[PDB]
Each structure stands twice: as C-alpha cells, then as structure tokens.
Amino acid sequence: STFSKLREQLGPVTQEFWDNLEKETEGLRQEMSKDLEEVKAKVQPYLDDFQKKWQEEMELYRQKVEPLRAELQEGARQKLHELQEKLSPLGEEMRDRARAHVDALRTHLAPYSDELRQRLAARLEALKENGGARLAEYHAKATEHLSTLSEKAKPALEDLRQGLLPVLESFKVSFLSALEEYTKKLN
Amino acid sequence: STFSKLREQLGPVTQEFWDNLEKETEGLRQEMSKDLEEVKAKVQPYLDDFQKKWQEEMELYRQKVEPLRAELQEGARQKLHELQEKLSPLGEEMRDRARAHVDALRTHLAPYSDELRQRLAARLEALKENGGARLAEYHAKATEHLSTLSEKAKPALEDLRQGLLPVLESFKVSFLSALEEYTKKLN
Ligand SMILES: CCCCCCCC/C=C\CCCCCCCC(=O)OC[C@H](COP(=O)(O)OC[C@H](N)C(=O)O)OC(=O)CCCCCCC/C=C\CCCCCCCC
Ligand SMILES: CCCCCCCC/C=C\CCCCCCCC(=O)OC[C@H](COP(=O)(O)OC[C@H](N)C(=O)O)OC(=O)CCCCCCC/C=C\CCCCCCCC
Ligand SMILES: CCCCCCCC/C=C\CCCCCCCC(=O)OC[C@H](COP(=O)(O)OCC[N+](C)(C)C)OC(=O)CC
Ligand SMILES: CCCCCCCC/C=C\CCCCCCCC(=O)OC[C@H](COP(=O)(O)OCC[N+](C)(C)C)OC(=O)CC
Ligand SMILES: CCCCCCCC/C=C\CCCCCCCC(=O)OC[C@H](COP(=O)(O)OCC[N+](C)(C)C)OC(=O)CC
Ligand SMILES: CCCCCCCC/C=C\CCCCCCCC(=O)OC[C@H](COP(=O)(O)OCC[N+](C)(C)C)OC(=O)CC
Ligand SMILES: CCCCCCCC/C=C\CCCCCCCC(=O)OC[C@H](COP(=O)(O)OCC[N+](C)(C)C)OC(=O)CC
Ligand SMILES: CCCCCCCC/C=C\CCCCCCCC(=O)OC[C@H](COP(=O)(O)OCC[N+](C)(C)C)OC(=O)CC
Ligand SMILES: CCCCCCCC/C=C\CCCCCCCC(=O)OC[C@H](COP(=O)(O)OCC[N+](C)(C)C)OC(=O)CC
Ligand SMILES: CCCCCCCC/C=C\CCCCCCCC(=O)OC[C@H](COP(=O)(O)OCC[N+](C)(C)C)OC(=O)CC
Ligand SMILES: CCCCCCCC/C=C\CCCCCCCC(=O)OC[C@H](COP(=O)(O)OCC[N+](C)(C)C)OC(=O)CC
Ligand SMILES: CCCCCCCC/C=C\CCCCCCCC(=O)OC[C@H](COP(=O)(O)OCC[N+](C)(C)C)OC(=O)CC
Ligand SMILES: CCCCCCCC/C=C\CCCCCCCC(=O)OC[C@H](COP(=O)(O)OCC[N+](C)(C)C)OC(=O)CC
Ligand SMILES: CCCCCCCC/C=C\CCCCCCCC(=O)OC[C@H](COP(=O)(O)OCC[N+](C)(C)C)OC(=O)CC
Ligand SMILES: CCCCCCCC/C=C\CCCCCCCC(=O)OC[C@H](COP(=O)(O)OCC[N+](C)(C)C)OC(=O)CC
C-alpha cells in the first residue's frame, strides 16, 4: 500500500504545474474565440440585409401565383364532377347485382351443406365408437409400462448418494482449509 | 440398464399391437372418406354453373364501360396539358430570377472563404508555436510518472505466484483422487 501513498504525493506536485501551463493556453484560446465572436457580429447585419431582400422577392411571387393557383383548382374540380356522375349508375347497379348473387349463393348452398355435414357427423360417430373400444385397453397398458421403471429409480439413486458422501466429506474439509490460505495471500 | 432394457423389451409387443389396431381403423376411415367423396363430386356442378353464370355478366359489363371510360380518359388527357402549360410561364420566370440570385450569392461567399483560410492559418501558426513547448514539458513529466507507476508490478506478482504453487499442486492431486473414485460409482 506504500506505492499508493507515493503516487498520491508525486501527482499533486506536477498537477499544479500542468494546471498553470493549461491556464495560459486557456487565455490564448479565449483571445482567439473573442476575435471570432467579433467577426460573427460584424458580418451579422450583412447577411441579415440580404435575407430581407430574398424574403420579399419570394413573397411577391406568392402573390402572383395565388390567382393562377386558384383557377387551376377550379379547372380540375369541374372535371371529376362530370366523371363521377358518369360512372355512378353502372357502379351502383353492378354492386346490387353482386350483392343479390351472394345471398342466392349462400341460400343455394345451404341445403347441400346441411345434408353433407349431417352425413359426415354420423360417419365420424361410427369411427369414434370403434376407436374408443381399443383406446381404453391401450391406456391401461400405458401406466403399467411407465410405473415399472420409476419404482426402481428412487431407491437406486438414493443408494448412490450415500456412497459418494463418505469421500466427498473429506474433500470438502480439505478445500475449506486451502480456501482460507488462499485469501491470506491475496489480502 | 437392466430395467431400462426391460421397458424396451415390452415396447414392440405393445407398439405392434396398437400399430396393427390403428391399421384396422384406417381401412374403415378409407371407405368413410371414399364414400363421402360421392357427395362432394355431386355438389361441384351446382356451384360451378352458378359462379360461371355470374362471370358471363361480369365479362359483358367490363366491355360495356370499356369505351365509356375511354371518353373520360381522353378528356382528362388534354386537360392535363392545359393545366401544366398554364403554370409553366410563371415557374419558368421564377427560374430566371433564382439563377440571378444564386450567382450573386456565390459572389458574396467567395471572399469570405478565401479570407477564412488566412485567418485559420494565422491562428494555427500562433497556437502551434505555443503548444509545441507545452507538449514537450507534458511528455517529460508523463515519462517520470510512468516509471514509478509500474516498476514493482512484476516482483509483486512473482511472490504471489511463488507462494501458491505448492498448495495448488497439492489440491490438484487431491481433486484427481476423488475424480476416479466417483466415476466407479457413477458408471
Ligand atoms: C484540456 C481540455 C480543457 C480542460 C479539460 C479539463 C477541465 C477540468 C476538469 C477536470 C480536470 C481533472 C480533474 C481531476 C480531479 C481533480 C480533483 C481535485 O483536485 O480536487 C481538489 C481541487 C478542487 O476540486 P473540485 O473543483 O472538484 O472541488 C470539489 C469540492 N468538493 C467542491 O466542489 O468545492 O482541485 C482543484 O481545485 C483544481 C485542480 C487542478 C489540477 C490541474 C488541472 C487539471 C485539469 C485538467 C487536467 C486533468 C488531467 C491532468 C493530467 C492529464 C493531462 C496532462
Ligand atoms: C434413462 C433415460 C435417460 C438416459 C437415456 C440414455 C439413452 C442412451 C444414450 C446414451 C448412452 C450411451 C452413450 C454412448 C456409450 C458408448 C457407446 C456404446 O455404448 O456403444 C455400444 C452400443 C452401440 O454403439 P452406440 O449405440 O454408442 O453407437 C455407435 C457408437 N457410438 C460407436 O461410435 O461405435 O450402444 C449402447 O450400447 C448404448 C449404451 C447406452 C444404453 C442406454 C443407457 C441409458 C441410460 C442409463 C441406463 C443405465 C442406468 C439405468 C438406471 C438409471 C436411469 C436414470
Ligand atoms: C414563393 C417562393 C418560391 C421559391 C422557390 C420554392 C421552390 C424551390 C425549389 C427549386 C427552385 C428552382 C430550381 C432550383 C434548382 C434545382 C436543381 C436543378 O435543377 O439544378 C439544375 C437546374 C437546371 O440547370 P441547367 O438548365 O443549366 O442544366 C443543368 C445544370 N448544368 C448541367 C447545365 C450546369 O438549375 C436551374 O434550372 C437554375 C435554377
Ligand atoms: C383519380 C382522381 C383524379 C382527380 C382529379 C381532380 C378532380 C377534382 C374534382 C373535384 C375536386 C374536389 C371537390 C370536393 C368537394 C365536392 C363537393 C360535392 O361533391 O358537392 C356535391 C355533393 C354534396 O357536396 P356538399 O358540399 O354538400 O358536401 C361535401 C362538401 N362539403 C360540404 C364537405 C364542403 O357531393 C357529392 O355529390 C359527392 C360526389
Ligand atoms: C364481386 C362483387 C362484389 C365486390 C365487393 C363489393 C363490396 C361492396 C361494395 C360497395 C358497397 C360497400 C358498402 C357495403 C355496405 C353493406 C354491406 C356491409 O359491408 O355491411 C357492413 C359494413 C356496414 O354496412 P352499412 O350498410 O351498415 O354501412 C354502410 C352504408 N351506410 C350505412 C353508410 C349507408 O360495411 C361498411 O361499413 C362499408 C364497407
Ligand atoms: C396416447 C394417445 C393419446 C390420444 C388418445 C387418448 C386420448 C384420451 C386420453 C387418454 C386416454 C385414456 C383416458 C382415460 C380416462 C380419462 C378420463 C378423464 O377425462 O380425465 C380427465 C383429466 C383432466 O385433467 P385433471 O388434472 O383434471 O384430471 C386428472 C385425473 N384425475 C385426477 C381427475 C383423476 O385427465 C386425466 O384424468 C388423466 C388422463
Ligand atoms: C409403449 C406402451 C406405453 C405407452 C405409454 C404412453 C402412451 C399411452 C397411451 C395412451 C394414453 C395417453 C394419455 C395418457 C398418458 C398418461 C397415462 C398415465 O399413466 O397417467 C398416469 C398419471 C395420472 O395422473 P392423474 O390422472 O391423477 O392426474 C394428475 C394431475 N394431472 C397430471 C392430470 C394434471 O400421470 C402420470 O403418471 C404422470 C407420468
Ligand atoms: C422416470 C419418470 C417416469 C414418470 C412416469 C412413470 C411414473 C409415474 C407414473 C405412474 C406411477 C404410478 C405409481 C406412483 C407411485 C408413487 C406415487 C407418489 O409418490 O406420488 C407422490 C406425489 C403425490 O401427490 P398427490 O397425491 O397430492 O397428487 C396431487 C396431484 N399431482 C401433483 C400428483 C398432479 O406426487 C408426486 O410426488 C409427484 C407428482
Ligand atoms: C371432406 C374431406 C375430403 C378429403 C379427401 C382427401 C382425398 C381422399 C378422399 C377421397 C378420395 C376420392 C377419390 C380420389 C381419387 C384420386 C383423385 C386424383 O386425381 O388424385 C390425383 C393424385 C393421385 O391420386 P391417386 O393416388 O389416387 O393415384 C395415383 C396414381 N396416379 C393417379 C397419380 C397416376 O393425387 C395424389 O397423387 C396425392 C394423393
Ligand atoms: C372472384 C371472381 C368473381 C366470382 C367468381 C365465382 C366465385 C365462386 C366462389 C365460390 C364458389 C365455389 C368455388 C370453388 C372453386 C374450386 C372448385 C374445385 O374444386 O376445383 C378443383 C380443381 C381440382 O384440380 P383440377 O382443376 O385439375 O380438376 C381436374 C378434374 N376436374 C375438376 C376438371 C373434374 O382445381 C380447380 O378447379 C382450380 C380452382
Ligand atoms: C376507373 C374504372 C372504370 C371502370 C369502367 C371502364 C372499364 C374499362 C376501361 C378501360 C379498360 C382498358 C382500355 C384499354 C384500351 C385503351 C388504352 C388507351 O387509352 O390507349 C391510349 C393511351 C395510351 O395507351 P398505352 O397502352 O400506350 O398506355 C400508356 C403507356 N403504357 C403505360 C401502357 C406503357 O391511353 C393512355 O395513354 C392512358 C394510360
Ligand atoms: C384533368 C386532366 C388531367 C388529370 C387526369 C388525367 C387522367 C389520365 C391520366 C393518365 C393518362 C393520361 C396522361 C396525359 C395524356 C398523355 C397522352 C400521351 O402522350 O400518351 C402517350 C405518351 C407517350 O410518352 P413517351 O413515352 O413517348 O414520352 C414522350 C416524352 N415525354 C412526354 C416522356 C417527356 O405517354 C406519356 O407521355 C406518359 C404518360
Ligand atoms: C412554380 C413552381 C411550382 C409549381 C410548378 C407547376 C408546373 C410544374 C409542375 C411540376 C413540377 C415538377 C418538378 C419539375 C422540375 C423540373 C423538371 C424539368 O423540366 O427538368 C428538365 C431538365 C431535367 O434534367 P436533364 O438532365 O434532362 O436536362 C435536360 C436539359 N439539358 C441539361 C440536357 C440541357 O432540367 C432542365 O431542363 C433545366 C432547365
Ligand atoms: C467548428 C469546426 C468546424 C470545422 C469545419 C467543419 C466543416 C465546414 C464545412 C465546410 C468547410 C470545408 C473546408 C474544407 C473543404 C473545402 C476546401 C476548399 O475550399 O478547396 C478549394 C480551395 C482550395 O483548397 P485545397 O484543399 O485544394 O488547398 C488547400 C491548401 N493547399 C493544399 C492547396 C496548399 O479552398 C481554398 O483555396 C481556401 C478558401
Ligand atoms: C463429490 C461429488 C462430486 C464432486 C465433483 C466431481 C469430483 C470428481 C469426480 C468425478 C469427476 C471425474 C470423473 C472421471 C474421472 C476420470 C476422467 C478421465 O479418466 O479422463 C481421462 C481422459 C483425460 O483427458 P485426456 O486428454 O487424457 O484424453 C484421453 C482420451 N483421449 C482424449 C485421448 C481420447 O479423458 C478421457 O479418457 C475421455 C474423456
């Protein structure tokens, strides 16, 4: 820890010198920034004046384009106003002719779908009846085939635990003693 | 592994039974689906003709509004040119004014860019002339701060490593003794 105290003392001495040296450059930069600040203020009205010119020039165009822009708004409006009405009758007509078809389709397929679904429902029943007969038997064999191994798993695993512990206990104690010695060297 | 083999032995016995059983139901499902197809194939024409009946109308409708939409199409083709041509003279005029303004603008920023190069060089030469002496001092001090910063880094680690090897090597052997002692039980 002695080395820490050394650097902690050597640093301050040189640090003060560094601060002083940097402080000189600080003022040097301030002078240069001051000159730059001056230049910014000097050319300020110059750019401002030119801006005011373009501002008015652009605005003058906005005034001239106003009426023309409004006319083109009308000329375009009077176009679709004629087109909309022209394509309205056939548009609504075709819509209805489609809607009625959908209704007819649904109603026409209804009777066919009923008989078909009922026929299938009855057919599926015949399958479930036969399947469920053998399904119960296979399920019974399942549990018998699974409980067999698990019964001989617990006692076996426990027997192994009691066999590893004896030597393990010795290792744990040996580790504890070594662990303490490790910390002593580190700290 | 003995009990594990037991569970595997009765596997095919139980599996083949269910496998063959499901095959029996498969034959039934086969006919169920085969006989059901007789219904599906009959419903096909009912829907096929109905959908085509409407398609015939759609095909006629499209051709009906075909020339009609063309009237509105051509009519909306000349109006586009008219609208654009009307807004052209004003836009083209503003383009000339823009050209004149941009040229004046570039003539104003030109001297500023040239003068800035001189101003930058002057500031560089001044700051550089001063910074040189500063950097030289910092380097000298930094070198001295570096020597006492990592001169005892090696010896400190050497002793830390030396007073550890014996204990470490002893633990390795101890751990190795337990290693094979547990494999016997595990295997
Ligand atoms: C260069 C770009 C422009 C400058 C950028 C840095 C600006 C300053 C900011 C950090 C600098 C590093 C700062 C490191 C921590 C310094 C900590 C320190 O010194 O504390 C003691 C005093 C006072 O500190 P504080 O100002 O933090 O006061 C704390 C106090 N609780 C309070 O608020 O009242 O120090 C002082 O008054 C002035 C000390 C001057 C030391 C020499 C000067 C140190 C300043 C900068 C250099 C630091 C590194 C030096 C070594 C590497 C470069 C050579
Ligand atoms: C238990 C469920 C979870 C574990 C499932 C493990 C399935 C097997 C997977 C790895 C084990 C084998 C890992 C490789 C072992 C070494 C390879 C070996 O055994 O070869 C013998 C034969 C044939 O060869 P392989 O099957 O290995 O295939 C070619 C071989 N690798 C080669 O390159 O030649 O394979 C065998 O006899 C199979 C041996 C294992 C039998 C089953 C051993 C199963 C595990 C334990 C059984 C004994 C303990 C039972 C009681 C406790 C149960 C938890
Ligand atoms: C109400 C105030 C509205 C103020 C204007 C708002 C909208 C401003 C948007 C664009 C302004 C007009 C176009 C400005 C240039 C756009 C980019 C462009 O086309 O450059 C090119 C364009 C055309 O230039 P030229 O015809 O010379 O041919 C290309 C250039 N060279 C290869 C010949 C060198 O420049 C101009 O026409 C002059 C302005
Ligand atoms: C591919 C698209 C190409 C389009 C090219 C440009 C077409 C320009 C045509 C029209 C410009 C937009 C006009 C928007 C206003 C239409 C007003 C109008 O329709 O009056 C006729 C009627 C009722 O209009 P209202 O004024 O009562 O309601 C809408 C307007 N307000 C009230 C919300 C202000 O509406 C219709 O009959 C619908 C067809
Ligand atoms: C292949 C031929 C058919 C092609 C597709 C045609 C689809 C229909 C075309 C045009 C009509 C669109 C609106 C249909 C409304 C009635 C059917 C429907 O969707 O009810 C569901 C929903 C609401 O329908 P409403 O009639 O209550 O509301 C719209 C009409 N009113 C109320 C504003 C007057 O639909 C919509 O909200 C609009 C999509
Ligand atoms: C491996 C093939 C799988 C597909 C084919 C067999 C599909 C049916 C599943 C197993 C077949 C045997 C069924 C045996 C009667 C089951 C009766 C039943 O509804 O139990 C329903 C029950 C629902 O879950 P819970 O946790 O509420 O009940 C657990 C059982 N105790 C506690 C309610 C008794 O789940 C079971 O009971 C376990 C199967
Ligand atoms: C290779 C031949 C043996 C194949 C065995 C697997 C295939 C079995 C075939 C058909 C049956 C499949 C569905 C039933 C599977 C489980 C059958 C069985 O023994 O359940 C046995 C047992 C039932 O438990 P509980 O009914 O009291 O329910 C408890 C609560 N929970 C789980 C329902 C939420 O659960 C176990 O033992 C867990 C392993
Ligand atoms: C290698 C693992 C194989 C797992 C599948 C085959 C073995 C399990 C299937 C059948 C075994 C049948 C004989 C079981 C004998 C032991 C029974 C036993 O001690 O149950 C012990 C305990 C009983 O708990 P409960 O009676 O309160 O049940 C509550 C509902 N649950 C949680 C069971 C869903 O359950 C457990 O500890 C684990 C869930
Ligand atoms: C309500 C749900 C109904 C689901 C039905 C699923 C299919 C089985 C159900 C009914 C069967 C009805 C009679 C079908 C006769 C064959 C129709 C057909 O063009 O098959 C076309 C094609 C081959 O069918 P196949 O295997 O019968 O013929 C094999 C030899 N050839 C014909 C390929 C030279 O399809 C396939 O290859 C994929 C399997
Ligand atoms: C969207 C446009 C305006 C509305 C148009 C009518 C829409 C009607 C909507 C629903 C009505 C039922 C439509 C059913 C379509 C499928 C019918 C069907 O099973 O085809 C089945 C068919 C099977 O394959 P292939 O075509 O090689 O058949 C060869 C043997 N056959 C069928 C000629 C004897 O595959 C197709 O036909 C392609 C679609
Ligand atoms: C808005 C929904 C209206 C529904 C009711 C009416 C449905 C029928 C209306 C139109 C159906 C298609 C008619 C196609 C024949 C006329 C096409 C035609 O105008 O040729 C004349 C002219 C040029 O035709 P192009 O083939 O050169 O097309 C333009 C070039 N590219 C894009 C094709 C590369 O048209 C145009 O310049 C406008 C694009
Ligand atoms: C209120 C009316 C305006 C708004 C509604 C417009 C509705 C029609 C919309 C699009 C189709 C009509 C576009 C305007 C009429 C075009 C007539 C025409 O020249 O057809 C043919 C024309 C051929 O063009 P090119 O490929 O030979 O190119 C020539 C050089 N430029 C023009 C590319 C510089 O097609 C076009 O130029 C592009 C569309
Ligand atoms: C008042 C402005 C806002 C309202 C405007 C409404 C009327 C115009 C409507 C839409 C305007 C869309 C943007 C148009 C931008 C200019 C389009 C145009 O003609 O470019 C035309 C052209 C494009 O570039 P190129 O490479 O093809 O040059 C061709 C000529 N040189 C260069 C080969 C000699 O550039 C010029 O001709 C410069 C004069
Ligand atoms: C707050 C810190 C800001 C730092 C600058 C940020 C970016 C400023 C944005 C744009 C300024 C970019 C300036 C550098 C690129 C343009 C340089 C340039 O003008 O080339 C055009 C011209 C000559 O430049 P050269 O690079 O060919 O010559 C350099 C000197 N030697 C090598 C020829 C001896 O410029 C001048 O003659 C001076 C007015
Ligand atoms: C106390 C509760 C448990 C505490 C944690 C476990 C304590 C130690 C107990 C068991 C862990 C070690 C079990 C295995 C001990 C023997 C390990 C052994 O003989 O390695 C032997 C060998 C070692 O590595 P080699 O580089 O010499 O490889 C030789 C084989 N090949 C690579 C040349 C093909 O590796 C093998 O032979 C195959 C993997």
Give the H or E element holding residue B31: helix B2-147
Instruction: Name the burial class of residue A171, with classes exposed (0-12), middle (13-18) and buried (19+) by CB atoms within 10 angstroms of its CB.
Output: middle
The C-alpha atoms of residue B76 and residue B96 are separated, in whole angstroms, by: 31
B109 lines ligand 14 (CB under 6 A): no
Q: Do B79 and A75 touch (CB under 8 A)?
A: yes
Chain B CB contacts of A181 under 8 Å are 167
Chain A CB contacts of B170 under 8 Å are 178
Alpha carbon of B150: minimum distance to chain A alpha carbons (Å): 10
Residue pair A148/B123 in contact (Cβ under 8 Å)? The answer is no
Copy the structure tokens of residue A91: 């548009």
C-alpha B165: how far from its chain's center? 50
Maximum Cα–Cα distance for chain B, whole Å?
Answer: 103
The C-alpha atoms of residue B41 and residue B36 are separated, in whole angstroms, by: 9
The C-alpha atoms of residue B121 and residue B116 are separated, in whole angstroms, by: 9
Residue of A nearest to B119 (CA): A36
Instruction: Annotate B108-177 with DSSP letters as a single string.
Output: HHHHHHHHHHHHHHHHHHHHHHHHHHHHHHHHHHHHHHHHTTSSSHHHHHHHHHHTTHHHHHHHHHHHHH
The C-alpha atoms of residue A67 and residue A72 are separated, in whole angstroms, by: 9
The C-alpha atoms of residue A90 and residue B64 are separated, in whole angstroms, by: 10
The C-alpha atoms of residue A46 and residue A34 are separated, in whole angstroms, by: 20
Q: What angle in degrees, to the nearest 10, is found between the helix axes of A89-151 and B2-147?
A: 110
Query: How many Cα neighbours within 13 Å face the side chain of B101?
Result: 13
How far are the Cα atoms of A70, B91, B109 from residue A73, in angstroms, in the given order? 5, 17, 41
Between the two ends of chain B, the Cα-to-Cα distance in Å is 11
How many CB atoms neighbour CB A114 within 10 A?
Answer: 10
DSSP letter for B29, please: H
Query: How many Cα neighbours within 13 Å face the side chain of A155?
Result: 3
Which ligand is closest to the CA of B57, given by its number? 10
Closest-CA residue to A14 (of B174, B142, B169): B142
The C-alpha atoms of residue B96 and residue A58 are separated, in whole angstroms, by: 13
> Phi and psi at residue B148, in whole multiples of 5°?
-80, 10
Q: Do A28 and B127 touch (CB under 8 A)?
A: yes
Query: Which residues precede gaps in chain B, with C-N > 2.5 A?
Result: none
Which ligand is closest to the CA of A26, given by its number? 1
Distance B51 CA to ligand 10 centre (A): 10
How far are the Cα atoms of A139, A148, B13, B52 from residue A143, in angstroms, in the given order? 7, 9, 15, 58
